[PDB]
Amino acid sequence: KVFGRCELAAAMKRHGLDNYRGYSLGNWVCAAKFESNFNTQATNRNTDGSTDYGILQINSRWWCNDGRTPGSRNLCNIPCSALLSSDITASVNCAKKIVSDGNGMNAWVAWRNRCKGTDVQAWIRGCRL
Ligand SMILES: [Cl-]
Ligand SMILES: [Cl-]
Ligand SMILES: [Cl-]
Ligand SMILES: [Cl-]
Ligand SMILES: [Cl-]
Ligand SMILES: [Cl-]
Ligand SMILES: [Cl-]
Ligand code: NA
């Protein structure tokens, strides 16, 4: 599924991400825009053989099982395919574990490089929330 901007902001708020670990909703929308262009089916292969999955490009090295990332963990206890659903629940529940891990949203390199310190409230401007 390709979300609209406000549609995704609403879905993320309904699943309890707004101000999760202190990160306002626009931070999560901005991260989704630059990780996936709001496409739940986005995948990207890394040089190390791990793969990033879904709207927040969650990596198989630590967070999900894809059966092709040797020596990896599955800390969200999900198949990586769950992260490609039209239903963002699994992506949201896993992102909550990642952002609690110690480095906050710096875990998302696109958020650090493209969202951090910017006017992220722009990403939810106009939305009925
Ligand atoms: Cl947009
Ligand atoms: Cl915001
Ligand atoms: Cl594996
Ligand atoms: Cl594990
Ligand atoms: Cl699995
Ligand atoms: Cl959803
Ligand atoms: Cl933090
Ligand atoms: Na894994």
Curated annotation (Swiss-Prot):
InterPro entries: Glyco_hydro_22, Glyco_hydro_22_CS, Glyco_hydro_22_lys, Lysozyme-like_dom_sf. Substrate binds at D101. Disulfide bonds join C6-C127, C30-C115, C64-C80, C76-C94. The keyword Phosphoprotein does not apply. One of its GO terms (biological process) is defense response to bacterium. It holds the Pfam family Lys. Residues 1-129 form the C-type lysozyme domain. It comes from the Eukaryota. One of its GO terms (cellular component) is cytoplasm. The active site is at E35, D52. GO terms for molecular function: beta-N-acetylglucosaminidase activity; identical protein binding; lysozyme activity. Monomer. This is Lysozyme C. It comes from Gallus gallus.
